[PDB]
């Protein structure tokens, strides 16, 4: 039931990219998408649009001390800007 | 016996005002540099 609800809510039609790269042309791929991939969801089923909230980055430190391991892995990071910010480049 | 009384009390209230100014600064610095430690929660996950 949980997987059914997840596939009904998050596998909607306007959140899918059909991407093809290689020896294909766009007209045949568009005809195939019209034939096979038409009418995925086209519905929200509760009139409740799901969205995204900005998740805050907080400074903290997690130390998983386990001294029987041969090597130690440490990752230190700060907050990145995002996808749409050009300064990532 | 005390020709020093007025100047001693002058340095007394100067010391009192300076100490009351500079003690909460070091107190807040100590509270910051130990509140990095007092927020630490520890967990034990044995393999059972």
Curated annotation (Swiss-Prot), chain A:
Tissue localization of expression: Expressed in neurons and astrocytes of the cerebral cortex and hippocampus (at protein level).
N6-acetyllysine: modified positions: 35
Phenotypic effect of disruption: Results in early embryonic lethality.
Disulphide bonds in the chain: none
Record PTM Phosphothreonine, positions in chain: 1
Subcellular location: Mitochondrion inner membrane
Function as written in the Swiss-Prot or TrEMBL entry: Component of the ubiquinol-cytochrome c oxidoreductase, a multisubunit transmembrane complex that is part of the mitochondrial electron transport chain which drives oxidative phosphorylation.
Subunit structure: Component of the ubiquinol-cytochrome c oxidoreductase (cytochrome b-c1 complex, complex III, CIII), a multisubunit enzyme composed of 11 subunits. The complex is composed of 3 respiratory subunits cytochrome b, cytochrome c1 and Rieske protein UQCRFS1, 2 core protein subunits UQCRC1/QCR1 and UQCRC2/QCR2, and 6 low-molecular weight protein subunits UQCRH/QCR6, UQCRB/QCR7, UQCRQ/QCR8, UQCR10/QCR9, UQCR11/QCR10 and subunit 9, the cleavage product of Rieske protein UQCRFS1.
Protein family according to the UniProt entry: Belongs to the peptidase M16 family. UQCRC1/QCR1 subfamily.
Protein name: Cytochrome b-c1 complex subunit 1, mitochondrial
Organism: Mus musculus
Gene: Uqcrc1
First and last residues shown, out of full length: 214 to 302 of 480
UniProtKB/Swiss-Prot annotation, chain B:
Subcellular location as annotated: Mitochondrion inner membrane
TM helices/strands, residue ranges: 11-31
Disulphide bridges: none
Intervals, Mitochondrial matrix compartment: 32-48
Record's function text: Component of the ubiquinol-cytochrome c oxidoreductase, a multisubunit transmembrane complex that is part of the mitochondrial electron transport chain which drives oxidative phosphorylation.
UniProt record similarity statement: Belongs to the cytochrome c family.
Subunit annotation: Component of the ubiquinol-cytochrome c oxidoreductase (cytochrome b-c1 complex, complex III, CIII), a multisubunit enzyme composed of 11 subunits. The complex is composed of 3 respiratory subunits cytochrome b, cytochrome c1 and Rieske protein UQCRFS1, 2 core protein subunits UQCRC1/QCR1 and UQCRC2/QCR2, and 6 low-molecular weight protein subunits UQCRH/QCR6, UQCRB/QCR7, UQCRQ/QCR8, UQCR10/QCR9, UQCR11/QCR10 and subunit 9, the cleavage product of Rieske protein UQCRFS1.
Identification of the protein by name: Cytochrome c1, heme protein, mitochondrial
Natural source organism: Mus musculus
Entire-sequence positions represented here: 278 to 325 of 325
């Amino acid at each position: 039931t949980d997987l059914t609800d997840y596939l009904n809510r998050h596998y909607k039609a306007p959140r899918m990219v059909l991407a093809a790269a290689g020896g294909v042309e766009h007209q045949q791929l568009l005809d195939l998408a019209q034939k096979h991939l038409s009418s995925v969801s086209r519905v929200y089923e509760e009139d409740a649009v799901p969205g995204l909230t900005p998740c805050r980055f907080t400074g903290s430190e997690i130390r998983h001390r386990d001294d029987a391991l041969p090597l130690a892995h440490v990752a230190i990071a700060v907050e990145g800007p995002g996808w749409a910010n050009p300064d990532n480049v | 016996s005390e020709p020093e009384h007025d100047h001693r009390k002058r340095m007394g209230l100067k010391m009192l005002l300076m100490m009351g100014l500079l003690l909460p600064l070091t107190y807040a610095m100590k509270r910051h540099k130990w509140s990095v430690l007092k927020s630490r929660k520890l967990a034990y996950r044995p393999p059972k």
